[model samples]
Target: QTPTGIYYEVRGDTIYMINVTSGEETPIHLFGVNWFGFETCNHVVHGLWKRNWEDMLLQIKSLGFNAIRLPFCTESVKPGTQPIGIDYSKNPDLRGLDSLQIMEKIIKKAGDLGIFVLLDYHRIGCTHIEPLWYTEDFSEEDFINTWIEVAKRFGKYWNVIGADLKNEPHSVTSPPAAYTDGTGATWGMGNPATDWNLAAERIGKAILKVAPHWLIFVEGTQFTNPKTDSSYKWGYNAWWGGNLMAVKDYPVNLPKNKLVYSPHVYGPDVYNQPYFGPAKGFPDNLPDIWYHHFGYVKLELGYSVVIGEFGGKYGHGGDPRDVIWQNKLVDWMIENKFCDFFYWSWNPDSGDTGGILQDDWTTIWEDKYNNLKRLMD
Candidate 1:
């Protein structure tokens, strides 16, 4: 028999949970307001306020999406603490509440709607490696303290199914740069490997202590080279080095069942696909490629995997052709029972990589919307 499910929530600034059998979708919260403002860093550049929280939530539920992955900058959680200049305390133009408060409202709404919410800490420092983890200002202990706070605050909320530890962690080029050669410093201190292990272990331990029931999605390290082929050059250096197999060998005593290995995949261009050349082949070929490259990691590690984010631009010279590839990949993921994923974003101004709604956020492209629904359905 399938095990009974649990429900958690944040009420009066406290986390709470209960067990239930039937999982129904409710109207908990609405998203897509561009909290970071127009044209700040890698976020949405320019577009009119098309839909508010209410309309967007209604539209998403209507489309049969029961969960929404809310992408938030680390600064959004505790502003003035990270490199990104996010003043969560004084932003009157936005909600004017601190990040945690805003998040609290979101969680409460999701609980009301019966929809599951995945709170993703999308740090804006450009890479998965956070600055504080490396810098002296925030030691390993400090990071753990932060998690303790987060888990204690949101742990009880049943709709808060998981906390995505980090998004798309890479080694060299992203934030808190670490290198394979053991050269270069991260957050102006220590090598990449040293800092990564510390952060993962500390944060993992802390969260488990505070909220053992919730899933902890830990992103793998970004290494310099893919494990299998050293000679094969996959251009574009990001977080590829942080391999989980290398990090936690023979079990080091963490909450194993509650942990999952998360990774992000980009295609030939992003990973330096020399074989595909300028004109790529069928979109359906992507899943096969993913399996070929990452299958070993899955088999050996034994941790559930999730494709956190995947998509391409809409009108970039290669985009139109790429959509077929994108669709094929999503189809393959669902077929294989991969974890639920959030498309890059719901904003139109995110270049071609936007969502079902256009830049205006008003016009829903039926073809794109239907394509996504077909994959999910």
Candidate 2:
């Protein structure tokens, strides 16, 4: 059977995907939502499903998105936990499958509905406190091995477009005591001691060795530069995974085409950043701020880029101020014809940045979602 899923290639400066068998090349725009259930404190996505999986996939297709960022924690893959072997008696279709097997089913189902999945290595443990890819228990080799295993497992599946290396690698100023920030966390200066770029190259090459079809979607650090080393930054601390300013200075040394610069930006729905202030109005400061912080990964550095996570609530007694913040981001992506974004989530809960689904876990936040629809290609 000719696979209907997509594969990517670069033409000039822009990266586009070639349909597996159709031989047609379309600039694949990944306007999608993140699924955090796999890596969360609770059950894997299907095991926790209230609605039918098919309906959810179809609804995702019915919406403007063409892809899904499916995140999974390392604990899910570890043995003895049996993350997928639990009772799925309710969903007859997925009654007996194991955890990763369930993911296989989802990939197939999502593919059937024309949705591509970017497997995101979101967390090392059940909790999301780990700022870096590898945590205390999970060593660097462990992290890489997890990717190698998962990559080899689902590599050949055309629907799984890429592997998001890590969720948000940040070394902030006032961090909690437990956050790890060594060789696996920090970015910039190509500091061989603790450089994300070097680690990315190592892991990315490891993935490409087996998952040849996968794109290495590498994210940026929270703090753009060394902590308390001010004078270079235009704004406050770069949000987690929103610090690619140093890319041009110390780029990820992977095969150029296989590397994608992924960063996450949030609005006032999350925090009140200095840039989103009175001095910075719409169409003026946001674009410039984005460019300086992370936008240059594609705009100037000539690499494939995606706002891996960016969205928040509206029209449900949520903040209207966030509309301007979210609006400019979507608009900026559209204006540059550089629209490749996988929104933060599709789940029912995210305290900082709520999901595309409302509290009911079924309805869409139409007001904000409709606005984001404009950014879709």
Candidate 3:
């Protein structure tokens, strides 16, 4: 245990997270992708001098990726404003650290390379976070005191498990913007300003009382109708940040494999989606719109989902119907095993959907890196 604490075990739909010093029992297959530029252009995580930080954690463990949803920008966590400094010839061991010590030196160098991190509060301002992204000049107790101060600063780091609490909530109905009666602001089941399941059960039981084995992803909203998908698209809406049918009616009470339902699928080179539009006949349907968004809540109401952010934008030799819709959304997450996803970045100036490195940030967008390396070989 990272100082005594860590837990998981769902057994049925599978997941068994234990940590008495790396006994990574199976069923916890988190093959990651997605690495936003520290929540803002220069807010942090910028070119760590020559694309540093062990060159972005050895190019995400040479592409076999383990984890890294990494995003942050609640005013870059106030005070002195973190490792925000740059151009000291780019990366002199990342000079003058701050910004939570550049996220604790990227969680002690991605836990010395076993790699795992989920902290993505995404945005509150400094580029965008307007009218949504959790209404600017924040409150939900300043987003639960910035997840109880970054889960008491990186919550005892077992590769810092998870905390992607708020990153893609749009038109987030409630939470008093002078109380709207405009039929927008529905996420309730205990109001905490439009209640995101009572604000993720109050910041997931206060960051699991200081990082009790992280995992709390929970995104989804901007609309939820999720009747089901493809061939034509059933009244699809929640896309700016993948909706989860209001989580089969306000779930997220926490514990028991710690709530991971998140979604963010996108394509048509990043949205014209309507099954990639042209009247639901474009790019050969993404498996009934990825099982009507979030694969029927973790494969038919089982729970624990996390495609936190999908990708698009094939570079030069791009579209061939966007590589048959990214190889049928990686063959519907490898035929329903839905092996935990995150691929929406790793930056190439994600001007919209383009960043598995390419723009000389390091290079590797070879047809969006060989169409997600054909779902890991």
- The candidate scoring highest on lDDT is 2
lDDT of 3: 0.66
Residue pairs with colliding backbones in model 2 are: 84-99
Which of the two, 2 or 3, has more lDDT?
2
Lowest summed lDDT over 10 consecutive residues: which window, candidate 2? Answer: 175-184
lDDT per residue, candidate 2, 1-377, as tens digits? 12335566555446677776768877777778887677865537732446666677777788878899988888665543444423354467767556667677888888777788888888888776476666557777998999999887777677788898988876644432212345335655445545677778888988888776678898887654444224354534577778777688778888776778888888877877766676756436788878878887787777888788887775355567687777778878888766778887787587766777777768888887888788774
For model 1, the superposed segments whose C-alpha errors exceed 4 Å read 1-49, 79-96, 124-132, 173-198, 224-253, 267-285, 295-302, 314-318
On TM-score, who's better, 2 or 3?
2
- The estimated TM-scores of all candidates read 0.70, 0.88, 0.33
Question: How much is 276 displaced in model 3, in angstroms?
Answer: 3.3
lDDT of 1 by residue, 288-351 (tens): 4565444334544555554555555533443465555566766776676553455555555554
Worst 10-residue lDDT window for candidate 3 reads: 224-233
Candidate 1 overall Cα lDDT vs. reference?
0.49
In order, candidate lDDTs are 0.49, 0.73, 0.66
Model 3 compared with the native: what TM-score?
0.33
Question: 1 or 2, which is superior by lDDT?
Answer: 2
Q: How close is candidate 1 to the true structure, as a TM-score?
A: 0.70
